[PDB]
Amino acid sequence: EAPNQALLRILKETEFKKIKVLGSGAFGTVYKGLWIPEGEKVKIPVAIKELREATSPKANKEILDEAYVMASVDNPHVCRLLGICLTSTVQLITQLMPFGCLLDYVREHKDNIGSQYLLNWCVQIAKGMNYLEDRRLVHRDLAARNVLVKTPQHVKITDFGRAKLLGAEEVPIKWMALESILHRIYTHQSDVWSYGVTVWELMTFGSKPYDGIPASEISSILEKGERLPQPPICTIDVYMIMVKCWMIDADSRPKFRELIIEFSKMARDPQRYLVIQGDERMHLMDEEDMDDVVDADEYLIP
Ligand SMILES: CCN1CCN(Cc2ccc(-c3cc4c(N[C@H](C)c5ccccc5)ncnc4[nH]3)cc2)CC1
């Protein structure tokens, strides 16, 4: 096993001004902010995850696990850790994805989202996931709520709160492979099952899977052979790919490298694959001292 030589960067609380809350409640609090690294003459828009004040050693072991995972990943379709702040309670600091998570974004823009975008998202999330697979990570929680939007054309997987290495042994029912609900087996192929669901969230513009059906029923339904319905905008070509991510025999499901390929072919002729009313005509941030703003993606460390 190759040694993990990622750099964990500790950041001074004076290097960054918080600027607004974005998401209170549950777990903790997520902020928009700006980060001015040491003496460098850049300002980097960031999100800051400072778990709900109470410092129970429990949740500390959990956020540092994320930190560990997020600091070890490096790919355009995966959200990177910029560093941590050891304040009183550990802050996670990461590139701001200003448009929020892809669930909310499709929910809120159904009338404006073309086939080109939906298939590109699919291609990009597959690349993300394929990258994790290369680094032997199993995400264990892929869902449209965990994909963030940097621009409507550029999404990245986030939330590594349950990532683990393959082999390692160390709850979202509706996105989980059957072997996982039955036996807590979890493989790159159980991730692919959740890709399946994630894709289905996007083609239904934000629907909740098995809306109604309560979690206890789920593994039964699935054993009976039921899956999610073909969404209205989906050609059978697209829906057949979802279906395959949902095959009982886990090795029977597609590999992420195959998904990249298939959606990518599809994205070359989007209207052949997704049928959306109005498709041909669809089209898709503060202070004055913005002279020195640089996106994290353009801020590299030796
Ligand atoms: C109708 C849409 N509505 C208004 C606009 N947004 C508000 C919003 C904007 C950005 C974010 C956001 C969260 C986030 C984020 N969160 C993850 C969990 C994170 C992980 C480690 C460290 C910090 C954050 N990471 C990076 N960029 C981010 N941006 C969340 C909500 C969505 C809801």
Side-chain angles (χ1 to χ4, degrees), residues 34 66 78 117 121 149 160 230 232 234-235 247-248 256 261 270-271 293:
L34 273 177
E66 265 200 85
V78 134
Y117 274 77
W121 299 334
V149 180
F160 296 87
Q230 177 156 359
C234 283
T235 59
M247 223 95 85
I248 298 311
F256 288 115
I261 292 164
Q271 254 133 298
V293 186

Side-chain angles (χ1 to χ4, degrees), residues 22 30 47-49 66 70 81 92-101 104 108 148 158-159:
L22 294 171
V30 178
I48 299 169
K49 180 155 87 161
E66 265 200 85
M70 264 211 264
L81 197 72
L92 253 39
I93 308 104
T94 194
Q95 194 192 202
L96 189 60
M97 313 292 275
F99 285 94
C101 86
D104 294 354
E108 134 131 294
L148 309 166
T158 195
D159 217 304

